[PDB]
Design an enzyme around this catalytic site. Structure first.
Site, short mmCIF file in Angstrom:
data_model
loop_
_atom_site.label_atom_id
_atom_site.label_comp_id
_atom_site.label_asym_id
_atom_site.label_seq_id
_atom_site.Cartn_x
_atom_site.Cartn_y
_atom_site.Cartn_z
CB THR D 145 13.55 1.64 -36.84
OG1 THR D 145 12.89 0.39 -37.13
CG2 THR D 145 15.02 1.37 -36.54
CB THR D 179 2.00 7.45 -45.55
OG1 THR D 179 3.14 6.61 -45.37
CG2 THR D 179 2.08 8.14 -46.91
CG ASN D 228 17.54 12.00 -47.88
OD1 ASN D 228 16.89 12.57 -47.00
ND2 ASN D 228 17.33 10.72 -48.21
CD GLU D 254 35.98 24.15 -29.40
OE1 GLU D 254 36.91 23.41 -29.75
OE2 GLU D 254 35.80 25.30 -29.87
N1 GTP Z 1 14.19 13.86 -44.93
C1 GTP Z 1 13.93 12.56 -45.02
N2 GTP Z 1 12.90 12.02 -44.28
C2 GTP Z 1 12.62 10.71 -44.36
C3 GTP Z 1 13.36 9.87 -45.18
N3 GTP Z 1 12.86 8.62 -45.05
C4 GTP Z 1 11.83 8.65 -44.17
N4 GTP Z 1 11.67 9.94 -43.74
C5 GTP Z 1 10.69 10.45 -42.77
O1 GTP Z 1 10.71 9.60 -41.64
C6 GTP Z 1 9.40 9.37 -41.15
C7 GTP Z 1 9.11 7.88 -41.19
O2 GTP Z 1 10.07 7.18 -40.43
P1 GTP Z 1 11.15 6.17 -41.07
O3 GTP Z 1 12.57 6.60 -40.78
O4 GTP Z 1 10.92 6.02 -42.55
O5 GTP Z 1 10.79 4.79 -40.33
P2 GTP Z 1 11.90 3.81 -39.71
O6 GTP Z 1 12.93 4.59 -38.92
O7 GTP Z 1 12.53 3.01 -40.83
O8 GTP Z 1 11.11 2.83 -38.71
P3 GTP Z 1 10.09 1.69 -39.21
O9 GTP Z 1 8.72 1.98 -38.64
O10 GTP Z 1 10.58 0.36 -38.70
O11 GTP Z 1 10.04 1.67 -40.72
C8 GTP Z 1 8.45 10.14 -42.05
O12 GTP Z 1 8.15 11.37 -41.43
C9 GTP Z 1 9.27 10.39 -43.30
O13 GTP Z 1 8.90 11.60 -43.92
C10 GTP Z 1 14.40 10.40 -45.93
O14 GTP Z 1 15.07 9.68 -46.66
N5 GTP Z 1 14.68 11.75 -45.84
#
Ligand code: GTP
Ligand code: ACP
Ligand code: GDP
Ligand code: CA
Ligand code: CA
Ligand code: CA
Ligand code: MG
Ligand code: MG
Ligand code: MG
Lengths: 425, 54, 352, 438
Positions: D145, D179, D228, D254
């Site tokens: 996503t 993962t 976060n 800016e």
């Molecule tokens: N810093 C940070 N990274 C995150 C967090 N949640 C997920 N990630 C990172 O985002 C990546 C995975 O993408 P997600 O944002 O979880 O997936 P998505 O946007 O929900 O898309 P889907 O495939 O539909 O689940 C991985 O590299 C995670 O380490 C978060 O809360 N904080």
């Protein structure tokens, strides 16, 4: 709400499936009557993935029991948790399949398949958002193998965009019922190559050797082998049954584990495997060493003969996640010659706080290794030893099959072997 | 080492220090891309059903 | 079990290091593209420094300092010395040098001619040498017209520097020579000088009235072994080692190699490497670096030491490969990855 | 006053968004119920904080934010969390099944069916703005996503809001907290289709945040919550100029003017200091020189790389706390005489400095300790190209075997879009080299 529909077909499929629900019911605090009696909210967090919620706070497994003879399912219904299954989800015939893939796939099985699909359709219509299906069955018999792969073909036709997952017991001459098992296994393997997204290969010889050499069981029984399968099925599904973001749903697991659509056959593993020194605490280094040791795997394939395309590890119990990462990184960095270098970071690790019953901690191993070709090589060799003399073919031609269909199944599996070979180099 | 554009307010101030001087796709085209990918999915599924029908 | 990769097959030095590492039974060599390594024996050109230190759980170490090329390039070294306050333009141990870009391409043409005209008018020795990094391509002349016209016929950056007309000549032979010092800088930026150097000598008598025949002016081991007719006459392979050279300095000049020469060499090595330390140090970096350097010096008849160039991928004298390569393993590799004396190096202490 | 709308896409965007708005409220004195006692104009106003918060007649200050995720579990946390009262249901959009880490699933399959709904909810926010500046878009590179649906949303925003600026806060994938094996694919695919639609993008490498948490905060195994809260401190430092009275980076335009002279090279490197553990007995408060000098240490950069071997195109110093201009210039002079800071010859060698006297706000019970002064440096270095190189290399290793490609083709994407996106990245790396190396 990401529901999974469970299907178990044939003797092996129903006996292993019964124990599976017996194990995870205990983990989720569901008693034999469907009443919850746990003490942790984590148990109910994702309970709707495998259980439907009925009136009175009852939890009914979303399971469909299929067989062409009544014997095995009568035992389940009379078993420990037999009363927990939905009565209408027992679908069985009386003829039997005579260990004959043709009877389960083309004749006897065909007469019964439509009624099974009515139950499947009923379970799916009540799912808020169905993930997909998982099937337990053996490949060496007639019902689970022949009718099982028939069910998969018709489920895929009706739900083409849902994930199809199987736990498939591969036959072995050392734990054999009939001589036609290579015939039935070769015919099923082709169906699996086409119509499943993930298949956990469970070799009865590996289960036997583990019970004999490691567990020190003098005379292993099917019950002993099924204890291993139960524990393994509970491990590989932990990601789906408890809170987590790694291999959280079936499609995400497939996307991380299957780089090529036909190479979706996994080797599972479990640790510990202790003979009855059973109270000794097991350290994280020990859990990891055993989890990657061939003697702890259930495909009867030596991983050092091929290469891992992808690996998924699940650690259960209260432990040092820091020490988990350290030991996992130690295994990859101390044996990186067995991991393909063209899939970066292809070893993924997941932790879960709830350990299995009677264990402070455990580790389940899921590997997509090119070594699995040895399993298909064995089957192919046994198939050809008989097929070159057309031995026992009359059981099948008598059910309408032609020899050409055997030749094609033979080529299809030798192609699969060749496809693994090219990625091992 | 010059300071320029100094602006001050109750909550802070800002300025610039200079150390050395110097020496799209339309809505229509987006719909076609989306519908083209949807068509390729429908074709692949049709071939799957045709294969299952055989 | 430590892991390393080899990405420069043509390195005689690290071929031996790789041979020694495997001899310990505690190092494992991986395919040159396997990113799960502890040690990289990297390529000479375009080493992908940006991909190092991003492997979870792996301490990664490379045998090259990113940015040390500033010191190991003819034109770059000239620019570094003239622009770094630590070395200054009045630096007394580096010959007067100028960067000259061929006219077919800042440039120091006019600045060079100004200093050239000053020497020509003051009856001083006005013999310069032109060279570049893209050579095996050297020209020695006293006429500025020949030097500049020789660079235009080429298409790469060149450097014109003063030619040491008063070199120290060994006897018997009346022959030129240069001194090669090997220097190892570890990840902590300790500057280790190998106790063994080599004088690459000329086997021909030095002739100041004929810069056309370059066999007696260039002490390169390849030129003496190809165009010289007295190769190996005075010393084996035109290679005199420190023991012999020190005994000579005592018999002829009544002094020692340490006093007359080695102090100036150690001073120069420190000055050069301390200058670029802030730019190439890997102290707080996600990966670690070390590197072996080959410094080349010239000694004049007044026993003053001059820096000629710095080599970033030097080769070693055949007789010294075993000792130096083992040293590289002890202080540079095992210091980061320990295994389950009387050091062969001289630590040049300094302020970080 | 001109409004800014924040858009949070996927798990990473949503959870980071939730942490930021928590911090924004503590900074502006807004309670979980949306009430702001200090705001003496009830039901309206055009103050600086109004760029991020609207107001109801009842005095509720409502974030100008939209949360989007193709799965409901993460956004359900917002619906029942501490700040459930801030947002109304129209602001929270969720589907039933996610993109499965598959860019093509988020962009084409699922994105096509939900894009018009998301645009409608944004339009409702835009219709409350008297002079909308643009959007701040939070998302990961790796998620299906965050990568696939973001690129589609950015394309449509350029169509429906042609004159509006768009900034990104993107999460660069790191294996220590991932993962998904296909994230290099998703990262490169989404950068290719978003490059021409984003005016300025702040990349945060999870590897950097992870190590900062372990090294400075003494967290042995950081969680997403730990990551976060630190990321939202950096985000807050970047958006403070839009929410507080000031003269530097006072609108989205800016940001580009001060940080992006060349439109394709629009990825400024963020550096933040100091990060001090709350569990510490008590820390010696760092000076302006020490925290400023810290901005040139790789350990505190949002993307690990070596700015000593690049060239600067712009540099902003954003200070919060007890800082007077005299000390800033003193530390800068000292840093020039010790550090390797080379600007491109077609840009002035200078620093734009902003100071907010209010020291950083720390969430109660969080991991960060209260500090008397802090700085966030925003520099546009060619050195950040190291991150593209790393990512593009992992892409090349898998694509050479066509590994996992069938998952994308199966969702309707053409294989040619892989090479098309990779070639765009190859040109991007070449642009960085032309600007930075001699
Ligand atoms: N810093 C940070 N990274 C995150 C967090 N949640 C997920 N990630 C990172 O985002 C990546 C995975 O993408 P997600 O944002 O979880 O997936 P998505 O946007 O929900 O898309 P889907 O495939 O539909 O689940 C991985 O590299 C995670 O380490 C978060 O809360 N904080
Ligand atoms: N300014 C100068 N005065 C006198 N001799 C000089 C000189 N510059 C170079 N030489 C001679 O040239 C020889 C080597 O030149 P240079 O080192 O520049 O070429 P090169 O780099 O290909 C050899 P290496 O890299 O192995 O030291 C030395 O032996 C030295 O005697
Ligand atoms: N592990 C295990 N394998 C079994 C069990 N029962 C049968 N098998 C194996 O399954 C194959 C026989 O298939 P079976 O399930 O009995 O035939 P079906 O009832 O027609 O599907 C043989 O290879 C047996 O070794 C069991 O309970 N556990
Ligand atoms: Ca019948
Ligand atoms: Ca107001
Ligand atoms: Ca635009
Ligand atoms: Mg049977
Ligand atoms: Mg040289
Ligand atoms: Mg998600």
């Amino acid at each position: 709400m990401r529901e999974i529909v469970h299907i178990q077909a044939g003797q092996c499929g129903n006996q292993i499936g019964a124990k599976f629900w017996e194990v995870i019911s205990d983990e989720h605090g569901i008693d034999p009557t469907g009443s919850y009696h746990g003490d942790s909210d984590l148990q109910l967090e994702r309970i709707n993935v495998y259980y439907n919620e009925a009136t009175g706070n009852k939890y009914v497994p979303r399971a469909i029991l299929v067989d062409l003879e009544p014997g095995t399912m009568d035992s389940v219904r009379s078993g420990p948790f037999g009363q927990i299954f939905r009565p209408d989800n027992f679908v069985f015939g009386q003829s039997g399949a005579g260990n004959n893939w043709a009877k389960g796939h083309y004749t006897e099985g065909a007469e019964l398949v439509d009624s099974v699909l009515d139950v499947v359709r009923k379970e799916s219509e009540s799912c808020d958002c169905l993930q997909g299906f998982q099937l337990t069955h053996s490949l060496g018999g007639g019902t689970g193998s022949g009718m099982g792969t028939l069910l998969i073909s018709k489920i895929r036709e009706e739900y083409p965009d849902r994930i199809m997952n199987t736990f498939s017991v591969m036959p072995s001459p050392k734990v054999s019922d009939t001589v036609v098992e290579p015939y039935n296994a070769t015919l099923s393997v082709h169906q699996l190559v086409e119509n499943t997204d993930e298949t956990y290969c469970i070799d009865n010889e590996a289960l036997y050797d583990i019970c004999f050499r490691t567990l020190k069981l003098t005379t292993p029984t099917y019950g002993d082998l099924n204890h291993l399968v139960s524990a393994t099925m509970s491990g590989v599904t932990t990601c789906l049954r408890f809170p987590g973001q790694l291999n959280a749903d079936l499609r995400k697991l497939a996307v991380n584990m299957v780089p090529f659509p036909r190479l979706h056959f996994f080797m599972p593993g479990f640790a510990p495997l202790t003979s009855r020194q059973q109270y000794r605490a097991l350290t994280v280094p020990e859990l990891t060493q055993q989890m990657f040791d061939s003697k702890n795997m259930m495909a009867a394939c030596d991983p050092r003969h091929g290469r891992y395309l992808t690996v998924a590890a699940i650690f259960r119990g209260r432990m040092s996640m820091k020490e988990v990462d350290e030991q996992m990184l130690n295994v990859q960095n101390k044996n990186s010659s067995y991991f393909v270098e063209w899939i970066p970071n292809n070893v993924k690790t997941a932790v879960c706080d709830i350990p299995p019953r009677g264990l402070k901690m455990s580790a389940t191993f899921i590997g997509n290794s090119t070594a699995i070709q040895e399993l298909f090589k064995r089957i192919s060799e046994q198939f050809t030893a008989m097929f070159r003399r057309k031995a026992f073919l009359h059981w099948y031609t008598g059910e309408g099959m032609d020899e050409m269909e055997f030749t094609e199944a033979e080529s299809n599996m030798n192609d699969l072997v060749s496809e693994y070979q090219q990625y091992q180099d | 080492m010059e300071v320029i554009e100094l602006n001050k307010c109750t909550s802070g101030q800002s300025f610039e220090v200079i150390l050395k001087p110097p020496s799209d796709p339309s809505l229509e085209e987006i719909q076609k891309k989306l519908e083209a990918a949807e068509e390729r999915r429908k074709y692949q599924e049709a071939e799957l059903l045709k294969h299952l029908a055989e | 079990m430590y892991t390393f990769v080899v990405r420069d097959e043509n390195s005689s030095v690290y071929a031996e290091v790789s041979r020694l590492l495997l001899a310990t039974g505690q190092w494992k060599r991986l395919r040159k593209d396997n990113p799960r390594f502890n040690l990289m024996l990297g390529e000479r050109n375009r080493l992908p420094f940006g991909r190092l230190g991003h492997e979870p759980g792996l301490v990664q170490l490379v045998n090259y300092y990113r940015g040390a090329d500033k010191l190991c390039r003819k034109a770059s070294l000239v620019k570094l010395i003239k622009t770094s306050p630590e070395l200054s333009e009045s630096c007394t141990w580096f010959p007067e040098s100028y960067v000259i870009y061929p006219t077919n391409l800042t440039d120091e043409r006019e600045v060079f001619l100004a200093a050239y005209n000053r020497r020509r008018e003051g009856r001083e020795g006005n013999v310069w040498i032109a060279k570049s990094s893209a050579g095996a391509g050297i020209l020695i002349s006293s006429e500025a017209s020949e030097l500049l016209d020789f660079i235009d016929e080429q298409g790469q950056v060149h450097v014109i520097q003063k030619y040491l007309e008063k070199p120290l000549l060994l006897e018997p032979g009346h022959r030129k020579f240069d001194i090669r010092s090997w220097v190892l800088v570890d990840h902590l930026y300790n500057i280790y000088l190998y106790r063994e150097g080599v004088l690459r000598t000329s086997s021909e008598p030095y002739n100041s009235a004929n810069f056309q025949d370059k066999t007696c002016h260039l002490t390169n081991h390849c030129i003496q072994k190809e165009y010289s007719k007295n190769y190996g006459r005075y010393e084996e392979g035109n290679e005199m080692f420190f023991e012999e050279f020190n005994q000579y300095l005592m018999d002829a000049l009544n002094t020692t190699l340490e006093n007359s020469i080695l102090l100036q060499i150690k001073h120069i090595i420190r000055s050069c490497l301390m200058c670029i330390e802030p730019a190439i140090s890997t102290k707080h970096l996600h990966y670690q670096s070390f590197q072996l350097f080959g410094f080349d010096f010239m000694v004049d008849e007044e026993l003053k030491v001059w820096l000629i160039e710095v080599n970033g991928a030097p080769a070693c004298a055949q007789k010294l490969y075993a000792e130096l390569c083992q040293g590289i393993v002890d202080v540079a590799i095992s210091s980061v990855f320990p295994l389950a004396p009387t050091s062969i190096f001289i630590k040049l202490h300094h302020h970080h | 006053m001109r409004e800014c709308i924040s858009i949070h896409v996927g798990q990473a965007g949503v959870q980071i968004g939730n942490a930021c708005w928590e911090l924004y409220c503590l900074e502006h004195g807004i309670q979980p119920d949306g009430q702001m006692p200090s705001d003496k104009t009830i039901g309206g106003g055009d103050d600086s904080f109004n760029t991020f918060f609207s107001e109801t007649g009842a005095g509720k200050h409502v974030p100008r934010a939209v949360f989007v995720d193709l799965e409901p579990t993460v956004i359900d946390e917002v619906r029942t969390g501490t700040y459930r009262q801030l947002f109304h249901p129209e602001q929270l959009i969720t589907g039933k099944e996610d993109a499965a880490n598959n860019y093509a699933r988020g962009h084409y399959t699922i994105g096509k069916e939900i894009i018009d709904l998301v645009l409608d909810r944004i339009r409702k926010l835009a219709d409350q703005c008297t002079g909308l500046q643009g959007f701040l878009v939070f998302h990961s590179f790796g998620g299906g996503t965050g990568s696939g649906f973001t690129s589609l949303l950015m394309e449509r925003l350029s169509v429906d809001y042609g004159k509006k600026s768009k900034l990104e806060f993107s999460i660069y994938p790191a294996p220590q907290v991932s993962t998904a094996v296909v994230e290099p694919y998703n990262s490169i695919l989404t950068t290719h289709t978003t490059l021409e639609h984003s005016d300025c993008a702040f990349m945060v490498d999870n590897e950097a945040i992870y190590d900062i948490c372990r090294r400075n905060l003494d967290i042995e195994r950081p969680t997403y919550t730990n990551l976060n809260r630190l990321i939202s401190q950096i985000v807050s430092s970047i958006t403070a100029s839009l929410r507080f009275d000031g003269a530097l980076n006072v609108d989205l335009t800016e940001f580009q003017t001060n940080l992006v002279p060349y439109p394709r090279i629009h990825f400024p490197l963020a550096t933040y200091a100091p990060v001090i553990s709350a569990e510490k007995a008590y820390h010696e408060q760092l000076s302006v020189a020490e925290i400023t000098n810290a901005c040139f240490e790789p350990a505190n950069q949002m993307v690990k790389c070596d700015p000593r071997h690049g060239k600067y195109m712009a540099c902003c110093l954003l200070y919060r706390g007890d800082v007077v201009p005299k000390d800033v210039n003193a530390a800068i002079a000292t840093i020039k005489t010790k550090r390797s800071i080379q600007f491109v010859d077609w840009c002035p060698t200078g620093f734009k400095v902003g100071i907010n006297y209010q020291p950083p706000t720390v969430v109660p019970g969080g991991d960060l300790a209260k500090v008397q002064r802090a700085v966030c440096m925003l520099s546009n270095t060619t050195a950040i190209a190291e991150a593209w190189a790393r990512l593009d290399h992992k892409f090349d290793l898998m694509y050479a075997k066509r590994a996992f490609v069938h998952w994308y083709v199966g969702e309707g994407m053409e294989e040619g879009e892989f090479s098309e996106a990779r070639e765009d990245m190859a040109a991007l790396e070449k642009d960085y080299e032309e600007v930075g190396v001699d």
